[PDB]
Amino acid sequence: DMIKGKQGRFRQNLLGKRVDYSGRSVITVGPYLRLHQCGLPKKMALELFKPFIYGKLELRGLATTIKAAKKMVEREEAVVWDILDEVIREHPVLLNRAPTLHRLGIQAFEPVLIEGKAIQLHPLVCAAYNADFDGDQMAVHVPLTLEAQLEARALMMSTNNILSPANGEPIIVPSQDVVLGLYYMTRDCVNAKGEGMVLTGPKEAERLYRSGLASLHARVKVRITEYEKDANGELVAKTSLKDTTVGRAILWMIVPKGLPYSIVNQALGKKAISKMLNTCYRILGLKPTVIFADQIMYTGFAYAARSGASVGIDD
């Protein structure tokens, strides 16, 4: 019985161990994060990285011996927090969510020290984790050796895993608030403020919208310069007058060079945004796709909040 069976052995103690330098806590939104990072509470970070703290403290000479380093960590003076910030700089941590169904259940992130007792998880990756902010918890492990650090940052980092290993399609597609905001932004209306005025570019579109001289969605003629890598990797600017909404122009600000304008020109729902990300990946590559996804998240969240979408009984 000790050997056989789930609770006994091989399953329990030889494929299912219980690592050190690990923690657990409740997950939270943290929209401001970069795709490759995660909000980590100070106190857990100190607890996890304790031996790193001692090593760095001794290197800097702040502590004569290891016991003095321990006492300095247990008082938690400003120097300790400074050393923790310095050591945390490039050190990546592993984030895991209880049912690790597929390999995207474990991903590496760069932590950013924050107050509170909850772990902050980047929104875009929730779909990969199947994470929901209704009391879901996550575990956080620390890779120790140099090879482990390199492996976590290279193989497991969120930005390196944008395509699902099952099928080629993207995993990090915007989920609900982002897509709602973008949808609100791109949809047009027959008549509003600033119908049919001609704008020299998206920047004055934003000038108009944020100053309240034009509606966030209103049909308008704008001059836009799209870039196309038609040659052997060179970008050629084509600049013409398109008939679009203010919102579509506002969104166009983020979009990297290589992509056709058409991409944003439509209603921009869930599918449209997903295929937008798809084309951005296929044409440009990884890094532009990552930054573009982050930009999409930020703009979607912002303009969803500006929209003020609610649900009344009469809706």
Partner: protein
């Protein structure tokens, strides 16, 4: 009582017209109040000069066509919208453009007047084709605050004007784009403090730093009347 004043005003000026500005030390919540006050004042209320109205010697309405310009009229209006001009003494001045021959008629080709300086001489205006290449126009520039679209003036156009009076959007404010992000920043013990990153694009004339300068100056000038605790 004793507040926390910002230090370390770093400015990453990539592409001279585009400036990122960071202010890491502050007090909780002042990030959005200060960022937004600055943003709105910069964007909506900034004294500047811009083209307002135009009379074309050849065309009576904005949808008609001139022979030998491939660009439509709307493109010429849009090109005229981008002109960033600074006049020193005079309040309202009327520049003339007259060009012939092949090529791109650019802002430099305008007649060089005394008080008025065009900050971007290479801004394209029109493209003239061969053997006819006749372009002549008179553009009137005025001083004002902020951005004024055509639609709000044309609304109050009961004072009937002769045909050809083509209104143009007035781009007074020198700022083309302005945005601010607020993010967490901690002074070694206090974490509920924030950093303000202000991304600003100006229209050549003044560099962003000085734009911010006169924005804060203007806002302080309005506030001066109440502030007396010193």
């Amino acid at each position: 009582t004793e507040f926390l004043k910002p230090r370390l005003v770093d400015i990453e000026q990539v592409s001279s017209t585009h400036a990122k500005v960071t202010l890491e030390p502050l007090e909780r919540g002042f990030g959005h109040t200060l960022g937004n006050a600055l943003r709105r004042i910069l964007l909506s209320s900034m004294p500047g000069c811009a083209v307002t109205e135009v009379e074309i010697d050849g065309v009576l309405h904005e949808y008609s066509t001139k022979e030998g310009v491939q660009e439509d009229i709307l493109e010429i209006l849009l090109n005229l919208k981008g002109l960033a001009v600074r006049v020193q003494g005079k309040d309202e001045v009327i520049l003339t453009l007259n060009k012939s021959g092949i090529g791109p008629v650019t802002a430099a080709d305008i007649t060089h007047d005394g008080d008025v300086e065009i900050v971007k001489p290479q801004h394209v205006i029109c493209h003239l084709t061969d053997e006819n290449a006749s372009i002549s126009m008179r553009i009137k520039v005025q001083r004002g605050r902020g951005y004024v679209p055509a639609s709000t003036r044309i609304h109050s156009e009961e004072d009937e004007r002769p045909i050809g009076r083509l209104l143009v959007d007035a781009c007074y404010s020198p700022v083309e784009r302005i945005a601010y992000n607020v993010e967490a920043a901690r002074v070694e013990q206090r974490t509920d403090l924030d950093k303000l990153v202000i991304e600003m694009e100006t229209n050549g004339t003044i560099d962003p730093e000085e734009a911010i300068r006169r924005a804060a100056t203007i806002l302080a000038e309005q506030l001066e009347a109440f502030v007396d605790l010193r």
